[PDB]
Amino acid sequence: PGLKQKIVIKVAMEGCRSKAMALVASTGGVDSVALVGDLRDKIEVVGYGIDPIKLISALRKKVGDAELLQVSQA
Amino acid sequence: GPGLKQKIVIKVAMEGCRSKAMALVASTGGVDSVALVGDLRDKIEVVGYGIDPIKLISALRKKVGDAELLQVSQAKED
Amino acid sequence: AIDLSRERDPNFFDNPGIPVPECFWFMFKNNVRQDAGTCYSSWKMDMKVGPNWVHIKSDDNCNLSGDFPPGWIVLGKKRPGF
Ligand SMILES: [Cl-]
């Protein structure tokens, strides 16, 4: 269940791109993860029933900084 | 450089698994994206550069479960 | 009888940093749909078709060709708006 979600996160990443990607890709509800922007400094997450609050707090716990740029129905 | 992106598609066996597979694949050097695709949502499409598909399959088989390489192609960037 | 007009679209993901592939492909064994995905027009890909790797070429109208094993085929069609 759920409407399809698109979430875009700006991540610090300085050692950590692989770590952010692994953590986001392991998250429940996630169908796709992609690095976006020319500098691959944003993560686009798409899927169903993803909790963006836990995701952001888990990314901050393990990669330092993480901001939501977008949450929308995809 | 003018080097084309890779597209690799891997079928993963399912259990309590697709999530561990996605995490392992996403953690690999040069990966731009991972997506669960296919009629049964049991295939991972990976896009990136400098990915060794044989080493990736071995890694998956070792740390997650059975996996079969289904596609290796290049992105048409022309 | 294989009829692509009656096949549901594949489950796909377009990577945003590379051009959108113009074709859907559908893989059949004895006319039973096995799976489906996307591929570029006027291009090529290596795909496992049953037991064999097959070099599959696409023309400008998503017609696919290759040395498919007996019983197997991969067919292409243009995605909407392409
Ligand atoms: Cl292709």
Side-chain angles (χ1 to χ4, degrees):
Chain A
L3 263 51
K4 196 180 200 193
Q5 308 162 282
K6 183 171 166 198
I7 298 162
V8 181
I9 307 162
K10 183 113 182 69
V11 193
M13 306 191 302
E14 189 82 347
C16 260
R17 251 173 205 76
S18 291
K19 289 166 160 145
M21 289 286 284
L23 192 173
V24 176
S26 71
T27 303
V30 167
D31 287 341
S32 58
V33 192
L35 291 170
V36 302
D38 289 305
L39 298 174
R40 301 165 67 256
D41 55 358
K42 292 166 278 283
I43 296 178
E44 173 202 296
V45 200
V46 171
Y48 294 87
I50 302 160
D51 179 337
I53 306 299
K54 287 198 141 69
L55 180 45
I56 290 290
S57 46
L59 272 169
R60 279 171 186 178
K61 175 97 177 213
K62 297 179 186 179
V63 166
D65 197 15
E67 294 300 355
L68 283 170
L69 298 185
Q70 180 183 339
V71 178
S72 57
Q73 50 174 327
Chain B
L4 292 177
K5 292 312 175 70
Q6 297 171 290
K7 180 182 302 180
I8 298 163
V9 181
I10 298 163
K11 170 178 287 293
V12 296
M14 298 184 290
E15 208 105 358
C17 263
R18 289 190 277 163
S19 186
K20 295 140 54 42
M22 291 281 284
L24 182 46
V25 175
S27 75
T28 304
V31 168
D32 292 346
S33 68
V34 293
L36 281 171
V37 298
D39 281 354
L40 295 173
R41 305 200 40 259
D42 64 345
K43 293 181 295 170
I44 302 179
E45 179 177 319
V46 61
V47 175
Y49 168 90
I51 302 161
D52 185 334
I54 306 302
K55 286 188 170 158
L56 184 55
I57 283 285
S58 164
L60 271 169
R61 272 173 187 161
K62 189 190 212 294
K63 314 200 79 195
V64 162
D66 199 17
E68 183 199 357
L69 185 57
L70 292 191
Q71 191 181 321
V72 178
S73 57
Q74 304 184 288
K76 183 184 68 176
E77 299 191 273
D78 40 90
Chain C
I2 296 173
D3 183 352
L4 291 189
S5 72
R6 314 278 305 174
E7 290 293 336
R8 74 198 177 283
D9 293 349
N11 175 40
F12 60 81
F13 176 67
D14 294 320
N15 175 275
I18 60 173
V20 180
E22 304 93 342
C23 313
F24 294 144
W25 63 258
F26 308 78
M27 182 176 335
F28 295 88
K29 186 200 182 179
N30 302 139
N31 289 8
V32 175
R33 170 169 169 162
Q34 302 297 301
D35 216 320
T38 67
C39 66
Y40 291 101
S41 56
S42 308
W43 204 234
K44 61 260 191 255
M45 57 176 165
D46 296 321
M47 188 178 294
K48 190 80 164 292
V49 184
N52 295 342
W53 284 98
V54 182
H55 188 71
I56 308 182
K57 282 163 82 183
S58 65
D59 74 5
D60 57 9
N61 203 31
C62 296
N63 301 302
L64 306 185
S65 54
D67 180 52
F68 304 117
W72 295 77
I73 197 166
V74 187
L75 299 162
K77 91 159 124 170
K78 280 211 106 62
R79 291 176 62 173
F82 287 91

